[PDB]
DNA sequence: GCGTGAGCTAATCTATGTGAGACTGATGTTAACCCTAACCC
DNA sequence: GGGTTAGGGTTAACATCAGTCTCACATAGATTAGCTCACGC
């Protein structure tokens, strides 16, 4: 459970060759290696990052070989992260004035693996590369990286400065069209010199040669992936094994080990008071003091206090042991099956909790897997769902939910979600938007928003090979507040003068939709605003925290 | 209407064949009304605490209201339910109760019908608070009270009517005794619910008493906005509506502390204390702080608060997303829901309620930015357009509007290891789809309980009460092995060998000489965390949770 | 149509004082309560200052706690029908070593030294470790986790 | 000396909210209890500057929170009425005076009209009573304070 | 220059509810260490 | 007379995470100081 990741990072003239409007190739690969070191530092995640660069002046190679090998210098080896790695990234400020072979570095990244690797136990290892592609080659190599066949648990992943979507995405706009975490619009494919052609080609080949053609998507952008959760991928950590038996009537019995999924995630860290003197939380103290009511008291001790629940206008003396005895007691961990009912019954409003599981399978052995394929294949092509009383533990309540079938090319699982529970439902009443007289919309209205809605859609019905192409979806774009936390606390610690920095530039652009779609409802927003009688200004409060007290000048 | 609190007037009769009955194992009428008074009680004090219930005996030989009437007699004032309200209703119950009751009240005594009836209005009209519903149960075994005076009925007709025009609704709950008489009689023009029925002339059983599902011991009703934003189409151009939430999970109403000497409540005061120096701080010499290895990070309170700050609070729209690109897998929150209000902005309904229409033509669904309070980050959410649904009874079950629906970040997904794909085969997914077919469901949201919060209010009311043991709550989420086994036959052993393997189960003592010995011999083995922990804490070293910690401060201590 | 057959002024103590019991509703309670009101004494509703906590034998909690008496107290005070003293019944009273270190020691001298089939999946072939050859924990371990460790160069080969 | 006590008791400390309008007075009266025989007053502590201060610059400086009037509002006649005593000015100590005088004349510059005035008139009063203490302060950016 | 009374809208202000951050402890899972059907030299 | 080949039976280490606690902020009636203006000085 620890993995070893490899950046090679390129330094070169033409790799800071930039043009107009456009950040710097070199720049947008110090956000991206800034991101990725920053969230595995202050995560506190246990692995190994060794930061190697190619082009600069010095050539450092431990190897180095004999002769050659130049202009390669290996800044860092494998070494748990540690700020002074992202403080120098940030004060690596010379892109090199040189040019090294693209393949050298990736040798160099292996032997650095394999040299620093050799005996210790690391769940995957992994090699990065944030190239440009624009230098002289070798044709000699290939011979010795392909047939290391991935004998060991490294990977690849490259990432170009082009716009790596390979599919019909000509763009070429001149709307200021590329913004570094833009979505959609990104830089004008094509366009590529006669050496970044064969390039990219040569990677292709790497990549379907080492994965296969699954490993064409695995090659990305500098600005997709500070959209994207791509540089982590390969490295992430399973979701821990959860052993149980789904059981119907007595005698039918299903191992079963569900794995966690899709669950709202928390920053791990947290914020300790400390006294602005020393610097020190050991002279900070505090305690809660449970005091009387009337004309307090000295002190009411810890031991004279018992438990107390409200019930109507009195208290009842309830007490922590009576709790303990005469409470609710079920049978430890639990999947039994209520019965089955329509996939209509069921909607995805009437959903609970803060996860989602998988329900897979058992392990390896593949005699329940039949079983459990059987079920989910006839709750499939077939309708009616499954209802499942579930309870994680001997201590946890017991909780209904859904089992719904989820087929894939790839795998075949259910998914459990919780279900209400009776005084957990809440019925209001609501006026009808329908009947109302007052609010009914005309018909200019209707047509003028219909134009707006079709407007601003967010999916392409593109090629009419009946596929929903998708714009900008917010699935796969990470939580920003992170991301934003981290460079926060980068600064303080980096420069413990200056205020909080405003948000990066491309954080607002990840949040944003494509430039398109905002261009293309103007004149259907304007119609709007002219047409709809929606302008109230109606004085109620307004967002104001400091400029209200403040100077000028 | 927020505000208002839901009162309750019950009407016990206790005339002479109220109380005498068949003699059989069934209750009698008085202490089946005597019983179901006092389900209504403990129904009404666990779930909304603070409607206002009373009690009204009429008939007895005493007599006790705000106005000298013969034959009445108000047992309880209206206020909140408690526990000593309870208690002072179930002597009554039993033998020695119908006794105790007669000592205590009488019965017979005939009694007018009218004056009653004036004095519930009285209690009605003498509370300071608002009035939501006002109701009165009239729990009777009889039907024709009247009939050999014909101006008694005409005056409880008419003192029916102006409790109706005043707003009082009552319902009796009739009861059902041996004979053939429980007729359609002069109760039928006076029950102001006037509720639907077949009002069929020969009934013979008990009357609607049973529909109160009777201790339906969990609810907490409630009403409110939650918030009040504003949806920003574009940067000029917004409407103001509310975000309420359907479903909310239920917790038990968390305890308090209390003084064991005198059982009242102690106030807590938490202030963080002196440095060791005496004194107390400021909350402006505290800042917040935070470490990463060697690398201590301090950073002020309001700086902190100000890390997590992008929008201002509203739902920013992005665009539009047909329907279909919304996988069921992904959930992260309960779907909150939007209604168009017009307090802010003046209009939103309009514009809001064609955009409905226009987007649930279209299938698509409102992406957005959603910002609920003035520091809290950004997050996606998918505004489903949720159209009107209601039954043939005039009843909405669905309300019209958008409902949210989170959509996690890429963060709040968890990868999956890799599985090897196994199909099945035809011949037992048909078995299989026999099974399911042979265990028909027609699942309602009304249909469990949380187990624990019913064990909870059950014990709660065990021991509020005495009953001498807590009410064993019926699990209604435990399945019914024995019933669905018997139910589903044999065909399981035809699915078991079908595709299971013939071979397939499916289931101090420590000092000084001792550790300078030890770190030569180096060990510190056998030796588990409870000793080393005790070792280290009696000892006085710093300690920690994991071993390694205390392997190296002991080590590197002890003799260096 | 017996039972209560003890003195009708047990529990009240000798200035006239009626002992005050709590015990949580329970079946043990439903005896007790009626075992208690034949004695003179008192049982209260909930917990009170002045009651005395009682607590059936085996209760962890309880025990932990050492502010019970023992429902065992009413029971033999019944048949003996004599009070006593209170605070008779009263309650209340490393496998590691396998470091990253070792685990390419293991291999080291063994995937080179030895020639026995029988040496894996078979005891034995440990004689030449752990005395001649160290590695400072139990003898019974490298043979538990070369099971766990039957695998390539540190993370396997494929 | 019952007073200084019982008041302090955790106004500065507690973390339950205490409510708006008792961050006003409470502090007045604190301030206010300094000008009754200083004598006791003179070794109690430096506390009363920092409780003062800290929360201004955080009433005042706060870039997250919408400022409560009525806590400034209240707090301004704390400092004043106890300026009275302990004859803090510029020559003996041009520490505190500097902040000080900062933050009254930013409660006198509204920089926007408003209702309920009562932050500014607090300022006012403190820069009438005494004006003496600001000895080198007040003449450096005359103009603007005259207009 | 200045008092003094009326109406109003801004400002609370507590009750109740909901969620974010910190925390704590029972629990089950993986793993160190050794023993055991059975054979067979 | 020692072992071999599997299957596994104790308990220690400890990482998880549901459950509980505290503090901040929202809405909704309920209630009043300030903030003006029309008069008298």
Redesign the pocket.
């Known amino acids: 459970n620890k993995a070893a990741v490899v950046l090679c990072m390129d330094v070169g003239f033409t790799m800071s060759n930039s043009i107009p409007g456009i950040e710097s190739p070199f720049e947008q690969a110090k956000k991206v290696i800034t991101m990725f070191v920053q969230r595995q530092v202050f995560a506190e995640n246990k692995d190994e990052i060794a930061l190697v660069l190619f082009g600069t002046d010095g050539t450092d190679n431990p190897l180095s070989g004999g002769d050659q090998y130049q202009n390669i210098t290996v800044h860092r080896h494998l070494m748990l992260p540690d700020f002074d790695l992202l403080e120098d990234i940030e004060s690596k400020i010379q892109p090199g004035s040189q040019q090294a072979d693209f393949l050298d570095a990736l040798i160099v990244s292996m032997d650095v693996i394999q040299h620093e690797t050799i005996g210790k136990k690391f769940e995957k290892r992994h090699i990065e590369i944030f190239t440009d592609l624009s230098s002289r080659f070798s044709k000699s190599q290939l011979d010795i990286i392909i047939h290391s066949l991935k004998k060991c648990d490294i990977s690849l992943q490259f990432f170009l400065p082009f716009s790596l979507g390979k599919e019909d995405g000509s763009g070429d706009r001149g709307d200021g069209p590329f913004r570094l975490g833009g979505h959609g619009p990104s830089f004008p494919l094509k366009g590529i010199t006669e050496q970044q052609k064969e390039g990219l080609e040569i990677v292709k080949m790497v990549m379907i040669s080492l994965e296969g053609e699954d490993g064409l998507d695995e090659i990305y952008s500098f600005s997709e992936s500070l959209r994207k959760l791509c540089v982590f991928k390969k490295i992430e950590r399973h979701?821990?094994?959860?052993?149980c038996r789904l059981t119907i009537g007595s005698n039918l019995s299903i191992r079963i080990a569900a794995y966690?999924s899709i669950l709202q995630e928390?920053?791990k860290k947290?914020?300790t008071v400390v006294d602005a003197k020393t610097l020190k939380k050991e002279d900070i103290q505090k305690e809660?003091v449970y005091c009387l009511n009337d004309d307090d008291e000295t002190e009411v001790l810890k031991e004279d206090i018992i438990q107390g629940f409200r019930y109507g206008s009195d208290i009842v003396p309830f007490s922590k042991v009576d709790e303990e005895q005469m409470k609710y007691k079920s049978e430890?961990?639990c999947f039994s099956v209520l019965g089955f009912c329509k996939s209509s019954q069921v909607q995805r409003r009437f959903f609970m909790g803060?996860?989602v599981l998988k329900v897979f399978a058992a392990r390896d052995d593949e005699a329940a897997a039949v079983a459990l394929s059987s079920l989910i294949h006839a709750l499939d092509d077939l309708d009616m769902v499954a209802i499942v009383r579930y309870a994680?533990?001997?201590?946890?309540?017991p909780q209904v939910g859904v089992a719904f079938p989820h087929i894939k090319h790839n795998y075949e699982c259910l998914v459990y979600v919780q279900l209400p529970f009776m005084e957990d439902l809440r019925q209001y009443m609501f006026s009808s938007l329908k009947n109302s007289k007052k609010y009914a919309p005309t018909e200019a209205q209707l047509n003028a928003v219909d134009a707006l809605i079709d407007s601003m859609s967010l999916a392409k019905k593109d090629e009419k090979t009946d596929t929903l192409e998708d714009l900008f979806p917010t699935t796969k774009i990470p939580n920003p507040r992170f991301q934003r936390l981290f460079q926060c606390l980068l600064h303080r610690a980096l420069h413990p003068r200056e205020p909080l920095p405003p948000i990066q530039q491309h954080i607002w652009n990840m949040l944003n939709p494509p430039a398109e779609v905002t261009t293309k409802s103007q004149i259907p927003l304007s119609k709007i605003k002219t047409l709809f009688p929606l302008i109230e200004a109606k004085?109620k409060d307004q967002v104001t925290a400091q400029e209200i007290f403040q100077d000028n000048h | 209407?927020?505000?208002g609190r839901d009162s309750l007037i019950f009407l016990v009769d206790a005339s002479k064949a109220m109380f005498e009955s068949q003699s059989e194992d069934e209750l009698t009428p008085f202490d089946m009304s005597i019983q179901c008074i006092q389900s209504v009680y403990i129904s009404k004090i666990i779930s909304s605490d603070?409607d206002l219930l009373a009690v009204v005996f009429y008939g007895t030989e005493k007599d006790k209201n705000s106005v000298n009437f013969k034959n009445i007699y108000v047992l309880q004032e209206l206020d909140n339910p408690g526990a000593k309200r309870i208690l002072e209703l179930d002597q009554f119950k039993g033998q020695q109760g119908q006794k105790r009751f007669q000592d205590m009240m009488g019965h017979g005594s005939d009694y007018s019908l009218s004056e009653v009836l004036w004095v519930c209005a009285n209690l009605f009209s003498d509370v300071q608070f608002?009035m939501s519903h006002k109701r009165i149960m009239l729990f009777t075994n009889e039907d024709n009270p009247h009939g050999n005076d014909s101006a008694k009925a005409s005056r409880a007709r008419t003192k029916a009517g102006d409790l109706r025009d005043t707003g009082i609704f009552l319902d009796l709950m009739h009861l059902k005794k041996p004979g053939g008489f429980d007729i359609s009689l002069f109760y039928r023009d006076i029950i102001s619910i006037a509720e639907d029925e077949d009002l069929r002339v020969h009934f013979e059983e008990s009357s609607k008493l049973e529909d109160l599902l009777r201790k339906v011991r969990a609810k907490?009703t409630?009403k409110?906005?939650?918030?009040?934003l504003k949806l920003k189409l574009n940067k000029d151009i917004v409407i103001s509506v509310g975000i309420y939430?359907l479903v909310?999970k239920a917790?038990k109403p968390?305890?308090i502390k209390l003084y064991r000497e005198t059982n009242e409540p102690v106030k807590?005061k938490?202030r963080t204390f002196n440095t060791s120096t005496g004194g107390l701080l400021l909350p402006s010499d505290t800042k917040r702080s935070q470490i990463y290895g060697s690398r201590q990070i301090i950073l002020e309170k309001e700086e902190t608060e100000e890390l997590?700050r992008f929008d201002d609070?509203g739902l920013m729209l992005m665009g539009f997303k047909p329907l279909v690109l919304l996988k069921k897998h992904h959930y992260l929150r309960p779907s909150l829901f939007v209604y168009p209000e017009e307090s802010l902005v003046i209009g939103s309904s309009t514009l809001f309620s064609a955009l409905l229409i226009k987007c649930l033509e279209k299938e698509v669904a409102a992406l957005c930015r959603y910002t609920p309070?003035?520091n809290?980050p950004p997050y996606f959410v998918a505004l489903v357009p949720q159209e009107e649904e209601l039954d043939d009874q005039k009843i909405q079950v669905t309300p019209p509007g958008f409902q949210l629906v989170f959509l996690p970040f890429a963060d709040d997904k968890r990868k999956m290891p890799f599985t090897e794909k196994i199909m099945a085969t035809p011949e037992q997914v048909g078995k299989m789809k026999a099974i399911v077919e042979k265990l028909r469901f027609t699942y309602r949201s009304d249909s469990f309980e949380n187990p624990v919060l019913q064990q909870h209010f059950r014990n709660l009311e065990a021991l509020a009460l005495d009953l001498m043991e807590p009410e064993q709550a019926v699990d209604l989420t435990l399945p019914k092995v024995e019933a669905m086994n018997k139910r589903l036959g044999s065909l399981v052993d035809e699915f078991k060998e079908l595709v299971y393997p013939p071979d397939y189960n499916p289931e101090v003592e420590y000092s000084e000489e001792e550790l300078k010995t030890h770190i030569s011999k180096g060990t510190l083995?056998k030796?588990?965390?409870?000793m080393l922990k005790e070792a280290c804490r009696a000892y006085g070293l710093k300690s920690g949770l994991?071993?390694?910690e205390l392997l190296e401060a002991l080590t590197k201590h002890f003799q260096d | 149509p017996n039972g209560p057959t003890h003195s009708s002024t047990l529990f009240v103590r000798d200035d006239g004082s009626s002992m005050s019991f709590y015990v949580r509703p329970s079946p043990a309670k439903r005896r007790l309560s009626t075992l208690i009101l034949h004695g003179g004494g008192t049982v209260c509703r909930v917990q009170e200052p002045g009651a005395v906590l009682l607590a059936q034998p085996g209760e962890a909690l309880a025990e932990a706690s050492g502010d019970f008496i023992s429902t065992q107290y009413i029971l033999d005070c019944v048949e003996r029908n004599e009070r006593l003293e209170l605070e008779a019944y009263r309650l209340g009273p490393?496998?590691?070593?396998?470091t990253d270190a070792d685990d390419v020691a293991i291999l080291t001298y063994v995937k080179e030294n030895a020639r026995?089939?029988?040496?894996?999946?078979?005891?034995?072939?440990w004689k030449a470790m752990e005395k001649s050859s160290l590695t400072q924990?139990?003898?019974?371990?490298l043979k538990?986790?070369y099971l766990?460790h039957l695998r390539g160069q540190e993370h396997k080969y494929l | 000396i019952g007073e200084l006590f019982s008041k302090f008791y955790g106004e500065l400390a507690l973390?339950?909210?205490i409510?708006?309008?008792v961050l006003e007075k409470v502090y007045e009266l604190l301030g206010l209890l300094g000008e009754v025989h200083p004598s006791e007053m003179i070794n109690n502590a430096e506390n009363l500057f920092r409780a003062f201060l800290g929360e201004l610059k955080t009433q005042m400086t706060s870039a997250v929170?919408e400022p409560?009037?009525?806590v400034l509002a209240g707090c301004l006649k704390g400092l004043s009425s106890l300026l009275c005593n302990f004859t803090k000015s510029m020559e003996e100590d041009p520490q505190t005076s500097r902040e000080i005088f900062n933050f009254v004349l930013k409660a006198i510059r509204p920089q926007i009209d408003?209702?309920?005035?009562?932050v500014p008139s607090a300022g006012l009063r403190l820069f009438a009573l005494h004006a003496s203490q600001f000895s080198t302060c007040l003449l450096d950016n005359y103009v603007s304070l005259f207009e």
């Not at chain 4, 408003?114 to 009562?118: D, G, I, M, T």
């Open positions: 979701s821990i094994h959860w052993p966690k928390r920053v947290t914020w809660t430890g961990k803060n996860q994680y533990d001997k201590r946890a309540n004085k | 209407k927020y505000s603070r608002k907490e409630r409110r906005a939650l918030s009040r939430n909310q917790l968390p305890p807590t938490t997590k609070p309070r003035r809290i083995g030796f588990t965390v409870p994991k071993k390694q | 490393g496998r590691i070593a396998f026995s089939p029988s040496s894996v999946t078979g005891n034995a072939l924990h139990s003898w019974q371990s538990d986790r766990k | 973390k339950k909210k409510p708006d309008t929170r409560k009037l009525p408003l209702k309920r005035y009562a």
